[PDB]
Amino acid sequence: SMEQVAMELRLTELTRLLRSVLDQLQDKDPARIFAQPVSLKEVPDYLDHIKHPMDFATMRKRLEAQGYKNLHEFEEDFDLIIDNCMKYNARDTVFYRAAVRLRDQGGVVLRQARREVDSIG
């Protein structure tokens, strides 16, 4: 149907906007702490601690399959990156601190992304 195509075009355009958001957020992680999944070879107990691991590469795979239907879903995954790190790692660590800085800086980007998603529809 033509209605299905129109919904598909909206999903495609959201995907474009989320790709630009994702790029901007990942620039706020210049150390690349959150670039890839925590390795279970290197942190074998990780899944005993963290039930839903997340990282920027995993988000990018989902994004490229047009797997985020709305901004809320995308934000959920970004918050997992931050929140998982702040649980597993202590306050005095470079990891925790990186997460706090990513959260604070990413907040700015996400605030305007929400306006754009609502604005453009």
CATH number of the domain bearing residue 108: 1.20.920.10
Q: ∠ at Cα 115 (109, 116), nearest 5°? A: 85
Domain encompassing residue 116: 1-121
Closest CA to 66 of 14, 30, 117: 14
Resolution of the solved structure (Å): 1.6
Contact present, 99 and 86 (Cβ < 8 Å): yes
Helix/strand/coil (H/E/C) assignment for every residue in the chain? CHHHHHHHHHHHHHHHHHHHHHHHHHHCCCCCCCCCCCCCCCCCCHHHHCCCCCCHHHHHHHHHCCCCCCHHHHHHHHHHHHHHHHHHCCCCCHHHHHHHHHHHHHHHHHHHHHHHHHHHC
